[PDB]
Each structure stands twice: as structure tokens, then as C-alpha cells.
From a paper:
Recently, two group A flavoprotein monooxygenases (FPMOs) (GrhO5 and GrhO6) and a flavoprotein oxidase (GrhO1) were shown to mediate the drastic remodeling of the 3 backbone and subsequent spiroketal pharmacophore formation. First, GrhO5 generates a ‐spiroketal moiety as part of the advanced intermediate dihydrolenticulone (4), which entails the rupture of three C−C bonds and a CO2 elimination step. The functional homolog RubL from rubromycin biosynthesis was shown to catalyze the same reaction sequence, pointing toward a universal strategy for spiroketal formation in the rubromycin family. In this work, the combined crystal structures of GrhO5 and RubL suggest three interconvertible catalytically relevant conformers, hereafter referred to as the “acceptor state” (FADox in OUT; accepts substrate, no reaction with NADPH), “reducible state” (FADox in OUT with bound substrate; reducible by NADPH) and the “catalytic state” (FADred in IN with bound substrate; reacts with O2 for hydroxylation).
To investigate the enzyme mechanism, GrhO5 crystals were soaked with 3. Gratifyingly, analysis of these crystals revealed clear electron density in the open, solvent‐exposed substrate‐binding site, consistent with the binding of 3 or 5 (possibly formed by X‐ray radiation induced reduction). In this conformation, the O1 and the O3 atoms were positioned in hydrogen‐bonding distance to the C4 carbonyl group and the N3 (only O1) of the isoalloxazine ring of FAD that retained the OUT conformation. This is different from the type I members RebC and PieE, for which substrate soaking of the protein crystals induced the movement of the FAD cofactor to “IN” alongside the rotation of several amino acid side chains. Importantly, the novel snapshot of the GrhO5 reducible state shows that substrate binding first triggers a distinctive side chain motion of the corresponding W281 that enables the reaction with NADPH, while retaining the sandwich π‐π stacking interaction. Evidently, movement to IN did not occur in the soaked GrhO5 crystals, presumably because FAD unlocking also requires reduction to antiaromatic FADred in order to disrupt the sandwich π‐π stacking interaction with the flipped W281 side chain (consistent with the previously reported movement of artificially reduced FAD to IN in RebC crystals).
Residue numbers in the entry: 5 to 94, 101 to 537
The structure:
């Protein structure tokens, strides 16, 4: 009945549901909580992440849900929101059609929830994975519902999106490396009349510091929902269980600094700033994604972004394995591609935490990469692609403006037109294998036909040429070939996740194009 089980219906579990259901994979997701968390959590989604979301219709609604917060331009440090202000302060179109999506997770998640439900994913909230076993043939998972009733869900594969304390990762005996837990915090979600204390003021985030509370205070677009994130010191013997609703009300009220503002605590969650990365992201039929794979220090919001990229990477791979078009070893490439990225990003988070706390060495500041290089400039060291002979390999990240369609990299953004209507290379990707070809590369259509037929996998052919053709992509400014690092007679095979899989810099005479592409694609699909 149900073929991929996801554990966790936070960001990554749901990005997984949307991506698997996009690819016509039967998904059951389980989330122990009765819905998606009202806490804001990770608030910035970088252009690359937005592009990923574009492929499943999530960018436009998320951009719409984000304009409410676009006004929230001011960062400040205060004694209390009602008290004294101590301090207050206030991509680009050749690379990406997307901008930074300033949207809290509690707004992005319901969008992903809706889209997953539309694409036919089964989402069981208030449902807890107790334990699981895996054999040669699949995975058997014990689910306890809200009523306390248990059942065994049978799946081909299990995706662990169950967060930092992932009982799956632990059940599998996958350890973790990194600098570990830096600080322990509690997120306190509450309802309050922010307007009555804000006036015309709108903040992104407020640092609160007075005798009774230190912490990070956020308000939503509506000025009704707020979060207070506070430290606790286990050296003082403080823990989570000290954050009783009494205690939570007292902190929030001292952060507001009013008394007259009625506060309703909705929930507190524990939240650690940590650098901890799984040794392995794949254990036979279990795929570890998200905070379960990589706790990342939150400065730059790399965690939530990395985890959606995890979900995007593994999703089509599972779809290809489940449909018998890819060898089971295709999934191993999830680990090969995303673990180095996971580990690199987690360390990037630590550099940023160090640069922001003003405790970085010039070496930490030297090694800290632009967020666009971290999220868009990735060159997978190895995985589901075929490298170019002779062309020197890329490091893990580069300036994404220097990338020219090297296999293992984001197939570049090239502005096109179809019947006068704007488009890009990116609009072409996300649904299946895409073969793109230059002006002189008309023969590569037969090439795509042969490989598609030979291997039983769809290959959407598009020639990119600088003069019209009704319903044909027009290379408006004649950039495609240069941008993809091929001649006008060349071809570039793009994976479902928009990563370049293979290319021919030159044309291939006769059947050679078809034989080569078949072998290229046979390798990427582990066949
Ligand atoms: C309170 C809090 C505040 C945060 N604040 C920030 C922030 O300010 N900045 C930032 O960059 N990141 C922040 N994060 C982290 C961010 O939310 C994650 O990086 C992002 O959501 C990716 O995590 P994930 O979806 O993989 O896992 P998580 O977000 O941890 O979600 C894991 C989910 O798995 C579920 N689960 C666990 N065990 C089971 C089980 N047995 N059965 C079913 N479901 C299970 C949990 O209930 C949870 O919903 C915060 C997280 C929390 C919890
Ligand atoms: C020592 O110095 C620090 C240490 C930290 O450990 C730290 C930290 O951990 C931070 C943080 C910090 O400033 C610091 C910080 O100074 C925030 O600034 C933060 O990014 C943030 C939040 C919400 C929003 C909402 C909106 C719309 O837009 C934002 O711009 C926005 C955010 O940007 C919620 C908290 C946040 O995610 C975060 O975790």
C-alpha cells in the first residue's frame, strides 16, 4: 500500500513528502505532534532553496506568505519591548530568478503540508514511530496513533526526518562527529497583542536583556503570535522541565515589559545550537535527512536550507529505485553527495556563529563563505553523475557565478522565451531527466529517444537556440552554450534535482550520441 515512510512532519519530512509525491511515490509520513509547530524556527530560505520549492509550486505561495514579514526590517536590543531600546539597525538577477524568502517555518510548513496532501501523500499527525526493523525486502515500523493504538507500517524505505535526537539514527548505530552542543535553549511560543506595545515599530528580531530574562524575541506579520528563545545553563542544574507554563508566562511577560498585555503560552520546545553530523546518511533501507543528519549552528539558517536540499536529492532517487529504472546503489549517492555538504555546511554554521558572536580568528573569517556559495555553489565530490575527462574537478563550493554546468553542479540559470512568455532552464528541470542541447545539436533528440527507450526512463529533450520556433525555448541573449560549458553542437543531461549528470562539449556523429548518453545515464542510474 505505502512505499516510502517518512518520520517527522517538520520541514524536511514534509519537503520529502512533497518531493516523493511530486514523483508519484506513495508516501506515508508520521509526526508524533498533532500538527506542524507554531514556532518560527528557521526564517530565511535562500534562492537555491526557493528554486527547489519552485519545482513543486511552493515558491509562489511562500513568497506571498512572506510579504507580510518583508516590512519587519529592524533588528534591536532592548530591556523589554515596552521598555528602553539599547540599539536598533535596518543573489541578483544574472544568477537566480529567486530571492531570499523571509518566511518562518510555521508558515512554510503548512504550505508544504497542503502541497503534499494535493499530490496524494498520506500525512498521519499525532502518530509516533516507536521502533522499526529492516530486512532485504523493506522496513517494518511500529506506529502508535493519538488514541494510543499501535500498527506495523510496511515500506520499501524509511526516511528519518525525526530531528536532532533522531531515535532512528540512534537505533541504526550511526554515530556523529562535530564540535557538539554549544548552548541549550527553549523556544516559548505565545499569543499577545504586539500592536499595543509595538505601535508603528516592526522588528525582524529583538534581543531582550533585563534582570529577569535574556533571550531572542520574534513577532509574526499579524502582531498576534510571538516567540521567546531563552538559554538555560546545565552547569547551574537548570533543565527543560524548569520551563513550566508559570515560568514561561513570567519570562514572556518580562520580555514584553507591560503587565497590561495578556499573554497565552501555546507551547515550549527545547532547541540546541550544535555542530553534530551523522557518520552515514544511508543505512541499507534507512535514509537520514535534516537535523537527524546535521545539526548546524543557526547563524545563517543553513540547517533548514541544507535539509530541504537533502529531501530534494534523495526524493527522485527513491522514485527511480522504486520504479526499477535505477539500481539500489543510486541511493548510496545521497550519502556521497549530501554528507560532505552536510559536514561542510555545519562547519560553515560554526564559522558564522563565531563571526556573529565577534569571537572569530582572521582564519575563521577567511574560511567563512557567502551564503550563496554555501547553498548554490555545490560541486558534489562524487555521486550520480559522470565527470568531464581532463577538466580539473571543482571544490565542494565555489562562487555560483563561476559554475558553467560541470557535472555534480546546479545546471545554470539561462533566461529563455516560449511564444513571447518568459522562462528559464530551471522551469525545464524538476520532473524527470532533461537533455538540453545547443543550436547545432538537433541530432541529440534521437540520442535522447534511444537512451529513454533503451533504459525505460523519460528524457525531456529541449534544444536551446537563439531564434524563435513556436513553442520552442528561445535563447534570448545567446548565453546557453557558454553558461553550460559546451559548444552549440553539445548536450547537457540534467537530473530531476537540476544537478548536471553528464555532458558532451561537442556533437556526436550518428549513433555515438545515443550510445554515449545511454552509458552516461546507465552509470548515473546504477545500471
Ligand atoms: C524550538 C526550535 C527552534 C529552532 N530555531 C531555529 C532557529 O532559530 N534557527 C535555525 O536555523 N534553526 C532553528 N531550528 C531548527 C530547524 O527547525 C531545523 O533545522 C529544520 O526544521 C530541519 O529539521 P528537520 O525538519 O529535519 O527536523 P526537526 O525540525 O527537528 O523536526 C523533527 C520532527 O520529527 C518528529 N519526530 C521525532 N521523533 C518522532 C517519532 N518517533 N515519530 C514521529 N515523529 C517524530 C518531531 O516531533 C519533529 O516534528 C529550531 C528548531 C526547534 C525545534
Ligand atoms: C552572539 O550573537 C548571536 C548568537 C546567536 O546564537 C544568534 C542566533 O542564534 C539567532 C539570531 C541572532 O541574531 C544570534 C546572535 O546575534 C537571529 O538573528 C535569528 O537568525 C533570526 C530569528 C528570527 C528572524 C525573523 C525574521 C523575519 O527575520 C530575521 O532576520 C530573523 C533572524 O535572523 C530567530 C533567531 C535566529 O534564527 C537565531 O537563531
Amino acid at each position: 500500500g505505502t512505499r516510502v515512510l517518512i518520520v517527522g512532519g517538520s520541514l524536511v519530512g514534509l519537503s520529502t513528502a512533497v518531493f516523493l509525491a511530486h514523483h508519484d511515490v506513495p508516501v506515508t509520513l508520521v509526526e508524533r505532534h498533532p500538527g506542524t509547530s507554531i514556532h518560527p524556527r528557521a526564517v530565511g530560505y535562500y534562492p537555491r532553496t526557493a528554486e527547489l520549492l519552485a519545482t513543486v509550486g511552493v515558491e509562489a505561495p511562500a513568497k506571498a506568505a512572506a510579504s507580510g514579514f518583508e516590512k519587519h526590517r529592524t533588528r534591536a536590543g532592548v530591556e523589554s519591548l515596552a521598555g528602553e531600546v539599547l540599539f536598533s539597525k535596518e543573489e541578483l538577477a544574472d544568477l537566480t530568478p529567486s530571492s531570499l524568502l523571509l518566511l518562518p517555518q510555521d508558515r512554510l510548513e503548512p504550505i508544504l503540508r497542503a502541497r503534499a496532501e494535493e499530490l496524494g501523500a498520506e500525512l498521519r499527525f499525532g502518530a509516533e514511530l516507536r521502533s522499526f526493523t529492516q530486512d532485504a525486502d523493506g522496513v517494518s515500523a511500529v506506529v502508535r496513533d493519538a488514541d494510543g493504538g499501535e500498527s506495523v507500517v510496511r515500506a520499501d524505505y524509511l526516511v528519518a526526518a525525526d530531528g536532532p535526537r533522531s531515535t532512528v539514527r540512534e537505533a541504526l548505530g550511526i554515530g556523529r562527529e562535530g564540535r557538539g552542543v554549544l548552548s541549550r535553549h527553549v523556544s516559548i511560543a505565545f499569543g499577545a497583542d504586539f500592536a499595543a506595545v509595538l505601535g508603528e515599530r516592526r522588528y525582524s528580531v529583538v534581543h531582550v536583556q533585563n534582570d529577569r530574562v535574556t533571550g531572542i524575541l520574534v513577532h509574526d506579520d499579524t502582531l498576534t503570535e510571538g516567540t521567546l528563545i531563552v538559554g538555560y545553563d546545565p552547569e547551574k542544574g537548570e533543565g527543560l522541565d524548569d520551563f513550566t507554563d508559570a515560568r514561561c508566562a513570567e519570562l514572556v511577560s518580562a520580555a514584553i515589559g507591560s503587565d497590561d498585555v495578556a499573554v497565552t503560552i501555546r507551547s515550549r520546545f527545547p532547541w540546541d545550537m550544535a555542530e553534530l553530523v551523522a557518520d552515514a546518511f544511508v543505512s541499507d533501507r534507512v535514509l537520514v535527512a535534516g537535523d537527524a543528519a546535521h545539526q548546524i549552528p543557526p547563524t545563517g539558517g543553513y540547517g533548514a536550507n541544507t535539509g530541504i536540499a537533502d529531501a530534494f536529492n534523495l526524493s527522485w532517487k527513491l522514485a527511480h529505485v522504486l520504479a526499477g529504472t535505477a539500481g539500489r546503489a543510486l541511493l548510496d549517492t545521497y550519502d556521497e553527495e549530501r554528507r560532505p555538504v552536510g559536514l561542510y555546511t555545519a562547519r560553515q554554521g560554526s564559522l558564522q556563529l563565531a563571526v556573529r558572536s565577534r569571537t572569530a580568528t582572521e582564519e575563521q573569517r577567511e574560511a567563512a563563505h557567502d551564503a550563496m556559495r554555501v547553498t548554490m555553489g555545490q560541486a558534489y565530490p562524487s555521486g550520480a553523475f559522470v565527470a568531464d575527462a581532463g577538466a580539473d574537478p571543482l571544490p565542494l563550493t565555489s562562487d555560483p557565478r563561476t559554475l558553467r554546468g560541470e557535472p555534480g553542479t546546479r545546471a545554470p540559470y539561462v533566461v529563455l522565451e516560449r511564444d513571447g512568455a518568459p522562462l528559464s532552464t530551471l522551469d525545464l528541470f524538476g520532473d524527470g531527466f532533461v537533455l538540453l542541447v545547443g543550436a547545432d545539436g538537433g541530432s541529440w533528440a534521437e540520442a535522447a529517444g534511444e537512451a529513454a527507450a533503451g533504459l525505460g526512463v523519460g528524457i525531456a529533450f529541449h534544444r536551446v537556440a537563439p531564434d524563435a520556433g513556436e513553442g520552442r525555448p528561445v535563447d534570448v541573449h545567446g548565453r546557453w552554450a557558454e553558461a553550460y560549458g559546451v559548444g552549440a553542437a553539445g548536450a547537457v543531461l540534467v537530473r530531476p534535482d537540476g544537478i548536471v549528470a553528464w555532458r558532451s562539449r561537442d556533437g556526436m556523429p550518428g549513433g555515438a550520441g545515443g550510445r554515449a548518453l545511454t552509458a552516461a545515464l546507465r552509470t548515473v542510474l546504477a545500471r
